[PDB]
Amino acid sequence: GADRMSKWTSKRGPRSFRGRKGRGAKGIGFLTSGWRFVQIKEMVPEFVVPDLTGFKLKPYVSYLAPESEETPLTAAQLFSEAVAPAIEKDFKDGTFDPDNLEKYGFEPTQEGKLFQLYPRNFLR
Amino acid sequence: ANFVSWKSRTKYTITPVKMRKSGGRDHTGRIRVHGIGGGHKQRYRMIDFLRFRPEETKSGPFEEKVIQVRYDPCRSADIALVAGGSRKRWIIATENMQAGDTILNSNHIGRMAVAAREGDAHPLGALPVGTLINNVESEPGRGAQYIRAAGTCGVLLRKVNGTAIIQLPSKRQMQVLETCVATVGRVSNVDHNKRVIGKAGRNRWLGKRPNSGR
Amino acid sequence: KARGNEYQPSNIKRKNKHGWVRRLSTPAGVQVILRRMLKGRKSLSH
Amino acid sequence: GLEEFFDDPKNWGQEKVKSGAAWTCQQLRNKSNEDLHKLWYVLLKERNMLLTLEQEAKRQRLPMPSPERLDKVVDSMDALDKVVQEREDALRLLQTGQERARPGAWRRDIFGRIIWHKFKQWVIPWHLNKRYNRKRFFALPYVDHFLRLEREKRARIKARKENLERKKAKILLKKFPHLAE
Amino acid sequence: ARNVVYPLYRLGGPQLRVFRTNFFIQLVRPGVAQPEDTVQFRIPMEMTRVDLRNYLEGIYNVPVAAVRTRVQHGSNKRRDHRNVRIKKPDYKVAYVQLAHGQ
Amino acid sequence: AYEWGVRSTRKSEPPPLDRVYEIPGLEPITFAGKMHFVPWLARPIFPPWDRGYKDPRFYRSPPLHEHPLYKDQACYIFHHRCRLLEGVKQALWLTKTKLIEGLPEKVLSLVDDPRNHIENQDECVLNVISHARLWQTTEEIPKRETYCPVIVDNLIQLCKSQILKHPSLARRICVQNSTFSATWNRESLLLQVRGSGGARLSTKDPLPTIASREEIEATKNHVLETFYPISPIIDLHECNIYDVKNDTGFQEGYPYPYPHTLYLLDKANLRPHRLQPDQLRAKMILFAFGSALAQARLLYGNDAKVLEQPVVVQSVGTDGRVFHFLVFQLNTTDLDCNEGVKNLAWVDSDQLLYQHFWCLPVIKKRVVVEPVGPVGFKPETFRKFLALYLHGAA
Amino acid sequence: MKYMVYPQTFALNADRWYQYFTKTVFLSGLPPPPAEPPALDLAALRAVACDCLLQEHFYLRRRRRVHRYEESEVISLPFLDQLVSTLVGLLSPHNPALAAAALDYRCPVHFYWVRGEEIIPRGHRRGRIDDLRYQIDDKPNNQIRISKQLAEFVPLDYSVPIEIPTIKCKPDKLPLFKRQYENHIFVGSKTADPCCYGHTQFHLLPDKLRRERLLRQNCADQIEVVFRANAIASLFAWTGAQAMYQGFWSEADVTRPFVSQAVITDGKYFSFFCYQLNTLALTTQADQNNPRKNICWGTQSKPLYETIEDNDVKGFNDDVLLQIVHFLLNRPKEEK
RNA sequence: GCUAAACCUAGCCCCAAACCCACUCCACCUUACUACCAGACAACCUUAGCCAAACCAUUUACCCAAAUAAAGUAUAGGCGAUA
RNA sequence: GCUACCUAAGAACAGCUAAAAGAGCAAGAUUUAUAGGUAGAGGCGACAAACCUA
RNA sequence: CUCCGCAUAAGCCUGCGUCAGAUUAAAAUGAACUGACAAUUAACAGCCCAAUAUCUACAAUCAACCAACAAGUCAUUAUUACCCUCACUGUCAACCCAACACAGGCAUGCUCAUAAGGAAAGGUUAAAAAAAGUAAAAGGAACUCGGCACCUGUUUACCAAAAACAUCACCUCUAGCAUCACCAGUAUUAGAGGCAGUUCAGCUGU
Ligand SMILES: [K+]
Ligand SMILES: [Mg+2]
Ligand SMILES: [Mg+2]
Ligand SMILES: [Mg+2]
Ligand SMILES: [Mg+2]
Ligand SMILES: [Mg+2]
Ligand SMILES: [Mg+2]
Ligand SMILES: [Mg+2]
Ligand SMILES: [Mg+2]
Ligand SMILES: [Mg+2]
């Protein structure tokens, strides 16, 4: 008699089932003695909203705009525009040496960084 | 959930321990012994059967005072709360055990037969020949496994070459070393057999359901 | 006197008896899931 | 304020509201990260206003004014995510050489299927994790036969589709004989 | 944000921040009579009332006194021509009370 | 000897290790690299894992011996939940005190004259009993966990109305949640008393000494009775991690440092949880002794000498219906030896305020046999209660 | 089914909604002085007030650590008990009634009443008239019950131009929730108790409503609302229960006012309220042409002290303390 | 005159040839589709009965790498059936 | 999830004779909610060779 | 009329709210069917807790007196560790399991006759037969298979009888022992068996 096809949700089942299951909201704390909930400020996502005053970009773009070819960014293109110039200058001056990759922005490891690329430890 | 034995407590205590009935089923959940089921809820009192168990620091013979003698739902005999030093424990009560009495537990074999005092625990070899004994152990330090029921008492027939011959309540000779502790006297509730159940309903209270063979 | 009312719905019983975790608990139950996957069942289990 | 959720009071009631084109990925790619961050909230407030108007139109049982505005805003925000994701993706490759942001591994499951298992974050090591260890990332021999039946089921479906395509081609030639080639 | 892994927080770690939230909300007309200081929203399932208060205050600069939410069940009664149930999606409803007597 | 804990309930023994570990120079290939178990690879051996930081909700405490306060010599602590097997007799030995049946003449004398009795005392006391046992809550029959605290509080409030007659009663306060600690040695046994629970009646002035020096010296002849084969420290918490410190319960400068009276409540609904009459009196002696000892050690230091100015502390113990009264004088702080001057304790026991209470009328054959209200009320008990309260202010 | 009315509530602007449910008009300040055509030892009362404030905060040694979320129940609650229990004893010579009064500790006060009607919106009972039922289950920290009623603050037919607030939506939007359970009318003791009249009530606001939390929740204007809502609900429930203990009800309205006083504090800030119950005819029928209104007087919360450093209380406000004494010195008028 | 009737596609079957499958994001072995705590449960072991012998009791079949032929031959078998 | 038995932890039972508590008239070898266990060469059965979702 | 009703639990999952409909019930207002729109807001409830050692003989019954037996839901301390806060989820209905003439089933609290909840008659006629109810001269079971008035426990039947099984007692049988049943038991124990009212008077459409 039970409905197998319908989605299983916290509305279904007895009181124990309904309390335990949630709707996908991320937890922001823990439960202590007496079912008291302690909210951890750091767990609560902090919205980083910028100052939009004096900002020229708007939701839409004027139709009188030169269409351009789509060129997705690649790791090579980023290297040629952000890292290649510094190495090219140093190589001419002979200052460049392999041991000093970090001078041009290379990170040997992600440990100790606030925003680590892999494994990603920051929200969108 | 599969059967888990309630007998999981590892530390001795005099506090009654909550018991779980089996209903005649083994760990497989199938009936092994028929006619077992229901009854009144019972709490287990950890009975100490190694009468001669001195305290951790102390050693040698010691004495205990009978604080209380009370009914036990888990056995036919009555039990006695005995306090010695800073430790209390549950023991089996003798026929004349009473509150306030002092009892002795010794593991010393005298050159002769020490005077037999009810409720004391001496080595079989020390006990006089032809004395009613109870709570006898097969091996030194094993703990009393025999003559533990209400009103039961074995006799020490003879002591020969470091061994003792005792008559079990079933009139069967048993031979044990002379360093095996035992308790002088009959077990409490000598009139246990006399009691009449009277009503079929009483059997259900004792946790015994109908058993039909065919 | 009642007839045809064998079903006494209980979500706890239904999940425990026929649930996903129950099926995976034994090799026979896993094969139950495999057969239903092969047949293309919309609901593999309760 | 709360009025940001609604369109310019002048526009209320107007059958249409003229709007510009959606941002393209190339246009956004020229902008800086700080500009994209500010543009996101500019687009976000516009999207919330349009979503609000769309719902009120249903409540009033009337058509939504200029519904294509919502399609444009969703296109621009999707493009903004792609442009920002590409920058992070390219940066990750250079610094770590990792294709994906989230660690994972190819695993076999209890059903014998090969799956990409995305890793979750834990405070304790896996060998001490009671719940994680209950999961079985292997299949036993009894799964082998079902894998063969599943493979043969896949082959039957593929064979039917290929056969049908060839049949349709013959029907096409029957109706259009010049297509013989 | 929704459909994104949250960086696990350990005691004493940095604050969790979301630079480009993908939460989109709808301000809606109440179906029934509400107090003057009450504003009703439809928000995503994953958005908590704490998120909504920060979301409105941070992005819209709306002082929020109280926030309450509930999960509205969407009817699954409708059947298509194949006699297959059609699911109206469940959505979350939020009730926001404006601060400062607004 | 029968061992407790059946094998089936004990943790299963580790599986037999793979034999590849036995072979020297061979590295067993394990599933540790896979990060999950597989039956066809050897089980890894994992090094003990440490979190590396502090996480309160998952904290583990160090081994007991490593604790900073761990001591090789055990200390026996008496607390509110300690139930003495020998009751008062054990308490008398532990505190090196002599027991005198009844209360002192000085205390009782205060209530001897009618001018000290409260107006309509019997009517007022009867209302207190009816309020706590019948009227206080919506429940038909209030339970001991509620009526026992209320009856004592109201009785103290009834005695507090005499501030009009005796203005000195303004110099006393009733303190809740106060705790005191006193440590002393008896026959080389380290003893401690951690006092908690009940109400502490505090006064700005010390109580007068009940017994003169002549009576204090007469105690030398008295010999502390002993119980054998029961230890004096039975039913006490044998503690190995402890601090040998003396605490009256308040920091320096408290306007009411002197513990006038200690009120102890046996407010347990279940009879087994409730203390026995003799056990409750034993708790009163130790708590009264503990409070007095804490005062003596504070004023006169940690030395073990006969006190020139003894300390008097009173205690009242009740379960809501039965009251026990105690006056304790700390004559000596030299407790290590049985011989010498001994402390004096005046104990009045098993004083019933009322025999029984009927919350509902008893009806037999549709006739009201017994009406609701206190049964067998004994106003004498309250006079003893009033006498202890008036003591030191009248 | 009835609405659970919580005197200590988190609902925004609850005081306005509670005024409608109880038909209560709220006035600022205290009631006009009682017209009338053993000195008070202020130095001894200030000392005792500071000896209770410093015992809990400083002198008393705590075995365990007191966390911020326990202060209200570990420090504030015991302080209020002693402050009341000691002032009543010290002031008993000045006010004879206190000597025979009954002092309660966290005793329940219940009041059940009907106010207004509704049309059942849904179900098999849709369209039928149903009474709007309300229940208050209060638990004041301390309360003083006397055996003789206090004097009224204004006449029974006292009227004011201030209108009673109305609501344009259902009470559920406060928010308010309905539950069905025992309907209790309780003054803190059963009817048999001779002490069936109310003197003063002492309320400690819960930690959830602490001033600090309200400030960071953008609810600074709600600080005074919490105090007012607590007083209106609690004193209405208490006086209403007292009137129903004398046989009065909606169809047999009170023939004399029923007054009571409340002191509402969070452990540092104190508020003083006076309530006069003039009518119980609150049902649509009984309240058809009923001109009587219930009156509640209240003051703005003031700090008793500013800070406590070690054993020194800095900033003790005698005005707040004297106001507590004035409430405790109110006595039932004696007969000729 | 109603009810109806009529239809040609959807796809499917058998071969041949080629060795197939599958990580947007998020969720999913706990009550699957559930962000976030000291694991420990671990897989391996003759297929059976029976088509037939007109019953049934030993006895017959379902795989191991080249179509054909040797050959239904050698051989096995209540020397029966049959293999 | 029926039913039989059992386990865990719950719950219900007016009046009347009323000593005795008892299917007396109208508190028990009673009834009952919840979760769990025992499975077909079997289980369970105050044994009808009954019952174990016809 | 009330047989209930309201609420909770369990189950169920939008399933008589608004608007519209050409759909639907006997019914071209109603609508539980279709389309669109709206809705149930936490205080109630669910969702809990740092470690190690240690503590926990005294039922309940108005718990007092007098009592018992089947022997019982209710408790800590020591030291270490810990400064933070109100998230998440259930909340609608004329509703479930059934049966398809409610045939029936369904836990708890409160109300104890309702302040809540409901409608036995589509209209007519007033034949038979049939069902139920009521009244009935004289008689009062006549004529009819048969009217009405060695303990205990289940069973078919029911006023019931009977037998069967169970079982107190009784009897024989096997067993000298412990860490999963028996049993945390020990021959005064455990298990397996056997146990051999009529007549009369009175009343009734029988
Ligand atoms: K439903
Ligand atoms: Mg909610
Ligand atoms: Mg709650
Ligand atoms: Mg509801
Ligand atoms: Mg009605
Ligand atoms: Mg009808
Ligand atoms: Mg008809
Ligand atoms: Mg007749
Ligand atoms: Mg005849
Ligand atoms: Mg006759």
Numbering used by the authors:
A (entry chain 9): 14 to 137
B (entry chain D): 61 to 274
C (entry chain 2): 47 to 92
D (entry chain Y): 63 to 243
E (entry chain U): 2 to 103
F (entry chain 5): 30 to 423
G (entry chain s): 89 to 125, 135 to 433
Authors' text:
Mitoribosomes are essential for the synthesis and maintenance of bioenergetic proteins. Here we use cryo-electron microscopy to determine a series of the small mitoribosomal subunit (SSU) intermediates in complex with auxiliary factors, revealing a sequential assembly mechanism. In this study, we determined sequential cryo-electron microscopy (cryo-EM) structures of stable assembly intermediates and initiation complexes at 2.8–3.2 Å resolution that involve six factors: RBFA, TFB1M, METTL15, mtIF3, mS37 and mtIF2. In conclusion, the model for the SSU progression through the assembly pathway includes a sequence of binding factors as an integrated network, with RBFA serving as a regulator through its allosteric control mechanism, which was not reported in a bacterial counterpart.
To explore how the SSU progresses through the mitoribosomal assembly pathway after maturation of TFB1M, we reasoned that an inhibition of the corresponding LSU assembly would allow the SSU to proceed towards later stages up to the subunit joining. The structural analysis of the SSU assembly intermediates obtained from the MRM3-knockout model suggests that disruption of the LSU assembly affects maturation of SSUs. To strengthen the structural data, we performed metabolic labelling of the nascent polypeptides in the MRM3-knockout cells and gradient analysis, which detected no mitochondrial translation or monosome formation.
